[PDB]
């Protein structure tokens, strides 16, 4: 990355949400929206989940419908912080420090509280996401935390739109930003 990277068309970006994000949380005891104002008094809506001391966790967070606007391949950039299991006093055997990213294609905004079902098949899993040793920092509220930035892509996608979902299964983490985009490409 010395040469400037290609423009990317942004399909969605949580950091530009004027109003509360309204992502669907299943179950509501799992992820929860937390709003932390940044450096310029811009507030960032984030989601976090930390039920490390509850068993059988399977916590889904699903975005709003996202229009594909032409792309066939989708890139998803995620900034998040994860607490290492080994840093948690009395940490149980079940503790995890990754989350899974999924997508689900739809021709229109058809999802509800129960549909699609909350599991891989009908969701497609993109990958299990882990923290790097590559960390930056941001300022949210008073404080500066370590954050990782990971990008994954998937396709081909053919329907008009899709949703993403993020699943925690027993870790402690904060999803601070998500940006979905595709590489803008002159044929």
From Swiss-Prot:
<feature type="disulfide bond">
    <location>
        <begin position="50"/>
        <end position="172"/>
    </location>
</feature>
<comment type="function">
    <text>Receptor tyrosine kinase which binds promiscuously transmembrane ephrin-B family ligands residing on adjacent cells, leading to contact-dependent bidirectional signaling into neighboring cells. The signaling pathway downstream of the receptor is referred to as forward signaling while the signaling pathway downstream of the ephrin ligand is referred to as reverse signaling. Functions in axon guidance during development. Involved in the guidance of commissural axons, that form a major interhemispheric connection between the 2 temporal lobes of the cerebral cortex.</text>
</comment>
<feature type="disulfide bond">
    <location>
        <begin position="85"/>
        <end position="95"/>
    </location>
</feature>
<comment type="similarity">
    <text>Belongs to the protein kinase superfamily. Tyr protein kinase family. Ephrin receptor subfamily.</text>
</comment>
<feature type="domain" description="Eph LBD">
    <location>
        <begin position="8"/>
        <end position="187"/>
    </location>
</feature>
<protein>
    <recommendedName>
        <fullName>Ephrin type-B receptor 2</fullName>
    </recommendedName>
</protein>
<comment type="subunit">
    <text>Heterotetramer upon binding of the ligand. The heterotetramer is composed of an ephrin dimer and a receptor dimer. Interacts (via PDZ-binding motif) with GRIP1 and PICK1 (via PDZ domain). Interacts with ARHGEF15; mediates ARHGEF15 phosphorylation, ubiquitination and degradation by the proteasome. Interacts with AQP1; involved in endolymph production in the inner ear. Interacts with EFNA5. Interacts with SPSB1. Interacts with SPSB4. Interacts with SH2D3C.</text>
</comment>
């Amino acid at each position: 990355a010395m040469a400037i990277s290609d423009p990317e068309e942004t399909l969605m970006d949580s950091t530009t949400a004027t109003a509360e994000l309204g992502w669907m949380v299943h179950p509501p005891s799992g992820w929860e929206e937390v709003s932390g104002y940044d450096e310029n008094m811009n507030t960032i809506r984030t989601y976090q989940v930390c039920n490390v001391f509850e068993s059988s966790q399977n916590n889904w967070l699903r975005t709003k419908f996202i229009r594909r606007r032409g792309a066939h391949r989708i890139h998803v950039e995620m900034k998040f912080s994860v607490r290492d299991c080994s840093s948690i006093p009395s940490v149980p055997g079940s503790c995890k420090e990754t989350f899974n990213l999924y997508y689900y294609e739809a021709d229109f905004d058809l999802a509800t509280k129960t549909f699609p079902n909350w599991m891989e098949n009908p969701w497609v899993k993109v990958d299990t996401i882990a923290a790097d040793e590559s960390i930056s920092q941001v300022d949210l509220g008073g404080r500066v935390m370590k954050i990782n930035t990971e990008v994954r892509s998937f396709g081909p996608v053919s329907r008009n739109g899709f949703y993403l979902a993020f699943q925690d299964y027993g870790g402690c983490m904060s999803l601070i930003a998500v940006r979905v985009f595709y590489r803008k490409c002159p044929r």
